[PDB]
Ligand SMILES: Fc1cccc(CNCc2ccco2)c1
C-alpha cells in the first residue's frame with residue numbers, strides 16, 4: 001500500500017550523461033554507442049540565442065571545437081551533424097554503459113522520468129508528464145540543457161525528451177532525441193507563450209483508481225454519466241476531453257476495482273462541481289494528473 | 305526555475321540490490337563490500353510473523369539456507385549474524401559496484417530517496433521524509449522488504465533506512481542499517497498504531513522559501529511573529545514546534561530571499577488560520593513538508 005510519484009531508476013541513464021563544451025557554453029549530452037546527442041544551442045553565445053542561424057554558426061565549428069567529457073576523461077569527436085535541434089557528435093569510443101534503448105516521440109499526457117544533470121553530472125530524478133500544451137513543469141537551472149526524459153520497459157530505456165528551453169513563464173520546452181520540439185517552440189531567446197495548460201483527464205481517472213485501490217474512497221458517489229455529458233463538464237473545467245481510447249485504457253483499473261469507467265467519470269464530475277471541501281485524496285488537495293493508467297497498473301502490481 | 309519533488313539518482317544503489325531467499329520467503333538485500341544486509345524476518349513464514357523468536361528461528365538456519373542472487377548469479381554465503389532486526393550475510397565476493405557509503409540514523413523530518421525493489425530488482429525511486437511519528441508514507445507491495453532509503457553527498461551514499469513493515473493503517477516502518485527500528489515498532493504481525501502524524505514545520509518553511517524563489521509570492525503577508533507566538537498556533541494545527549535550531553538552518557534561504565524567518569513564520573501562521581482559499585503554491589493545494597532546508601538549497605543552487 002501507499003501510492004507515490006515514482007521515477008524509473010536512473011542508473012542506466014546516469015551511465016550515458018556527458019559534458020559537452022563548445023567555446024564558453026557547457027551543457028549535458030547523451031552518449032549512446034559512439035554518438036553524443038546534445039542541444040544544438042551548445043554552439044551559441046547567449047548573444048547568438050536572440051536570433052541564431054544554426055547552419056551559419058555551425059560552419060565556424062570543427063569536430064575539435066566540441067569538447068566531450070565522460071567522467072573526467074575526454075572523448076575524441078571524429079564527426080558532427082545537426083538533426084533538427086540536436087547535434088550528434090560521433091566519438092571514437094562506443095559507450096561501455098550504453099543500455100538497450102529506443103528514441104520515442106511521446107503524446108501529451110504521457111509521463112516520463114527526468115534525470116536533471118549539470119556539467120554531465122546527475123543532480124536528481126523526478127517524474128513528469130508532457131502537458132497538453134507540449135510544455136513540461138520541470139526543475140531546471142542554467143547548465144541543465146541536454147538533461148533527458150525517459151521510460152524503462154524491463155531493460156530497454158526509451159528516450160522521449162531532451163531539455164532545451166525555459167519559457168518566460170518558467171515552464172520548460174524540449175525535443176525528442178531526433179531534435180524535433182514538442183509543440184510550436186524554437187531554440188531562440190524570444191517571447192514564446194504556451195497554450196492552455198489543461199488537466200490530463202485520463203490520468204486523473206487512473207489516479208482516482210489508484211486512490212480507491214489504496215483505501216481513499218470518500219469521493220466515490222452514487223452517479224454515472226456519459227462521455228458526452230462528462231466532456232461538456234470537462235471542457236468547462238480546462239480538462240482534456242475523454243475518448244473511447246481513454247476508456248479502453250482504463251479497462252483493467254475498472255476491472256480490478258469493479259468501478260465502471262463512466263461511474264468514476266461521474267465521481268470526477270462531482271469533484272469538479274463540488275471541489276474537495278478541504279479533504280485530500282492520496283494526501284493531495286488537488287486532482288493529480290501525472291500518473292498514466294500504465295503508471296497506476298505498474299506501481300499497483302509492482303513491475304521491475 | 306520550477307521546483308520538483310526530486311530523488312537522488314539511484315544508480316549507485318541499483319548496483320547494491322540483491323535477492324535474498326530463505327525457504328519460501330524472498331525479499332531484497334543490500335550488498336556492500338562482502339556483506340548482504342536484509343530484514344531478519346526473511347527467516348519467517350507469515351505464520352512465524354505472528355509471534356517470532358528470531359534467535360530460536362535462527363538456530364534452524366545455516367549459511368547455505370540463505371540464497372543470495374545478484375543479477376542472475378548466486379553469491380556464496382560464508383557467514384551470517386543478526387544485528388538488531390537485520391541479518392548480515394557474509395558472501396565470498398565483495399560487491400564490484402560498492403559505492404563509498406555510510407550508515408546514518410536520521411532524525412524525524414529528514415528526507416531521503418527510496419529505491420523500491422522486488423526480487424532484488426529496482427522498480428522505482430521516490431523522495432520521502434521520516435514522519436515525526438517515525439513512520440514513512442511509502443509505496444511498498446509484498447516482496448518490497450529490504451528496499452533502502454539513502455542520501456548522496458557527491459559520491460558517498462548515506463544509507464538511512466531499510467523497509468520492514470506495513471502497519472495496519474498502510475504507513476511503513478523500518479530500520480537504520482544497524483537494524484534499529486525508527487520509532488517503537490517491532491518486526492511482528494501485531495496491532496501497532498502510529499502516533500500523531502504532525503507537519504514538519506521547518507520543511508514547510510523551506511518550501512515556502514522555494515516558492516518565493518520560484519515566483520509564487522501571493523501568500524507573503526505584512527506580519528511577523530515570535531517563536532513562542534508561532535509555536536502556540538503550530539501546536540493547535542498539528543505542526544511540529546519550531547526551535548532556534550530550525551531558524552538557524554533556514555538562515556541561507558532567509559538571506560537569499562531577504563524574508564526574515566519569523567516573517568515567513570507569520571506568513572505560514574496566516575496560511576494555517578485562513579487556509580489557501582482555493583489557491584496553490586508550487587502547484588500544491590496543501591503545504592508540502594517533504595523538502596528540508598538543505599533540499600531547497602541543493603535543488604535551487606543545482607548541486608550534483
Ligand atoms: F561499447 C558498447 C556499446 C554498446 C553497448 C555496450 C555494453 N553495454 C552494457 C551495459 C548495459 C548497461 C550498462 O552497461 C558497449
Ligand SMILES: Fc1cccc(CNCc2ccco2)c1
Nearest residue numbers: 319337398399400401402403404
Ligand atoms: F569488490 C569491491 C569492493 C568495494 C568496492 C569496489 C569498487 N567499487 C567501484 C564502484 C563505485 C561505483 C560503482 O562501482 C569493489
